[PDB]
Design an enzyme around this catalytic site. Structure first.
Site, mmCIF file in Angstrom:
data_model
loop_
_atom_site.group_PDB
_atom_site.id
_atom_site.type_symbol
_atom_site.label_atom_id
_atom_site.label_comp_id
_atom_site.label_asym_id
_atom_site.label_seq_id
_atom_site.Cartn_x
_atom_site.Cartn_y
_atom_site.Cartn_z
ATOM 1 C CG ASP A 10 -23.364 7.169 1.723
ATOM 2 O OD1 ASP A 10 -24.393 7.389 0.211
ATOM 3 O OD2 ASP A 10 -24.151 6.043 2.168
ATOM 4 N N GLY A 46 -27.255 2.828 4.365
ATOM 5 C CA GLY A 46 -25.644 2.486 4.274
ATOM 6 C C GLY A 46 -25.621 0.752 4.693
HETATM 7 C C1 LIG Z 1 -34.246 6.770 16.031
HETATM 8 O O1 LIG Z 1 -33.714 6.920 14.219
HETATM 9 C C2 LIG Z 1 -32.260 5.840 14.802
HETATM 10 C C3 LIG Z 1 -31.600 5.442 15.598
HETATM 11 C C4 LIG Z 1 -30.206 5.595 15.921
HETATM 12 N N1 LIG Z 1 -29.547 5.332 16.712
HETATM 13 C C5 LIG Z 1 -28.244 4.900 16.071
HETATM 14 C C6 LIG Z 1 -28.851 4.698 14.980
HETATM 15 C C7 LIG Z 1 -27.384 4.365 13.565
HETATM 16 C C8 LIG Z 1 -25.881 4.335 14.107
HETATM 17 C C9 LIG Z 1 -25.534 4.046 13.044
HETATM 18 C C10 LIG Z 1 -26.098 3.777 11.818
HETATM 19 C C11 LIG Z 1 -26.561 3.587 11.392
HETATM 20 N N2 LIG Z 1 -27.782 3.672 10.091
HETATM 21 C C12 LIG Z 1 -29.129 4.380 9.856
HETATM 22 C C13 LIG Z 1 -29.484 3.910 7.995
HETATM 23 C C14 LIG Z 1 -28.751 5.314 7.891
HETATM 24 N N3 LIG Z 1 -28.003 6.491 8.383
HETATM 25 C C15 LIG Z 1 -28.910 5.959 9.691
HETATM 26 N N4 LIG Z 1 -28.274 4.313 12.671
HETATM 27 N N5 LIG Z 1 -30.032 5.087 14.709
HETATM 28 C C16 LIG Z 1 -30.545 5.296 13.186
HETATM 29 C C17 LIG Z 1 -31.730 5.675 13.164
HETATM 30 C C18 LIG Z 1 -32.374 6.210 11.795
HETATM 31 C C19 LIG Z 1 -32.733 4.902 10.954
HETATM 32 N N6 LIG Z 1 -33.529 4.690 10.451
HETATM 33 N N7 LIG Z 1 -34.121 5.933 10.578
HETATM 34 C C20 LIG Z 1 -35.138 6.607 9.383
HETATM 35 C C21 LIG Z 1 -33.698 6.548 11.551
#
Ligand SMILES: COc1cc2ncc(-c3cccc(N[C@@H]4CCNC4)n3)n2cc1-c1cnn(C)c1
Length: 289
Positions: A143, A33
């Site tokens: 997306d 994103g």
């Molecule tokens: C344990 O992992 C996570 C925990 C978590 N809590 C909130 C978010 C979050 C909130 C808003 C946007 C956002 N964007 C990411 C980028 C593409 N979509 C997810 N992530 N989040 C994301 C991951 C994660 C991120 N990459 N991977 C491999 C895991």
């Protein structure tokens, strides 16, 4: 509505945006994103900090992420806690989703146990409920994909990453075609902007849920997951050939019901796809008895 952090606060709580992976002791969870997402700790609470990586286009994605979250509170959308806009790097702070992305739980990355069919049905329904909420509030996501569907403590699905979201009232084109090819509708690849493309992408996600396969795999035949739909239609294969074998509770009837939804979502002609309310209804009937 949301809390304004200074950039240095988010720097301090992410161990100075420690780029090493979580597994090595760092704070970087992943990228997507149009940002890199870090784990932080604020007042004994775990948070996720998305740091956005043209200049005007990046600010526009930032403002778009904030506007959607101000208008859209829902059980199946990630929750924004705050942001930072001082300094040179824009950051968004979210409620932490401890079970990570649907993409990684379907691949069992890091050795997590496979999702059952019962859990997969609740995830599909929840994700559909989230998209429905966006479309009802006149937003196109643009997306939709399993890396942008996160899972909380109860494996509730939450749509994330709204930087590309657009207001949706005729279907217009854009000159800047963005997205992940393996999830995109044909008209989106030609540059059209329409909620009908969200439905198509959701259809690909449903195939990921059913098969446990990623949407694209360069070393697989077929490389693109959406190709199995034409194989099944041409009776070269059955959906049973592709059902994820890492489940013990998948019954034929409800799998075929979810596959039917996915197949309808993936219609080549945008006007022949169901809208999200219809998708939501079919998924609810899927588990009704
Ligand atoms: C344990 O992992 C996570 C925990 C978590 N809590 C909130 C978010 C979050 C909130 C808003 C946007 C956002 N964007 C990411 C980028 C593409 N979509 C997810 N992530 N989040 C994301 C991951 C994660 C991120 N990459 N991977 C491999 C895991």
């Amino acid at each position: 509505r949301f809390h304004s952090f200074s950039f240095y606060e988010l720097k301090n709580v992410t161990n100075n945006f420690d780029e090493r992976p979580i597994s090595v002791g760092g704070n970087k969870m992943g990228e997507g994103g149009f940002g890199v997402v870090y784990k932080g700790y604020v007042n004994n609470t775990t948070v996720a900090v998305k740091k956005l990586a043209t200049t005007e286009e990046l600010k526009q994605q930032f403002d778009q992420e904030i506007k959607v979250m101000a208008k859209c509170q829902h059980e199946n959308l990630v929750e924004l806690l705050g942001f930072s806009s001082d300094g040179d790097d824009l950051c968004l702070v979210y409620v932490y989703m401890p079970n990570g992305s649907l993409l990684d739980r379907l691949s069992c990355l890091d050795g997590t146990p496979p999702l059952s069919w019962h859990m997969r049905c609740k995830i599909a329904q929840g994700a559909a409920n989230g998209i429905n909420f966006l479309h009802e509030n006149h937003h196109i996501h643009r997306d939709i994909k399993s890396a942008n569907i996160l899972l909380d403590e109860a494996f509730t699905a939450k749509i994330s990453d709204f930087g590309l979201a657009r207001a949706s009232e005729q279907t217009v084109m854009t000159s800047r075609i963005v997205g992940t090819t393996a999830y995109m509708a044909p008209e989106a690849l030609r540059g059209e902007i329409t909620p009908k493309s969200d439905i198509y992408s959701f259809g690909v996600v449903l195939l990921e849920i059913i098969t446990g396969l990623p949407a694209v795999d360069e070393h697989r035949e077929p490389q693109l997951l959406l190709d199995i739909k034409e194989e099944i239609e041409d009776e070269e294969k059955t959906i049973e050939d592709y059902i994820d074998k890492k489940m013990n509770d998948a019954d034929s009837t409800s799998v075929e019901a979810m596959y039917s939804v996915a197949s309808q979502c993936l219609h080549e002609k945008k006007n022949k796809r169901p809208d999200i309310k219809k998708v939501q209804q079919l998924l609810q009937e899927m588990t009704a008895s």
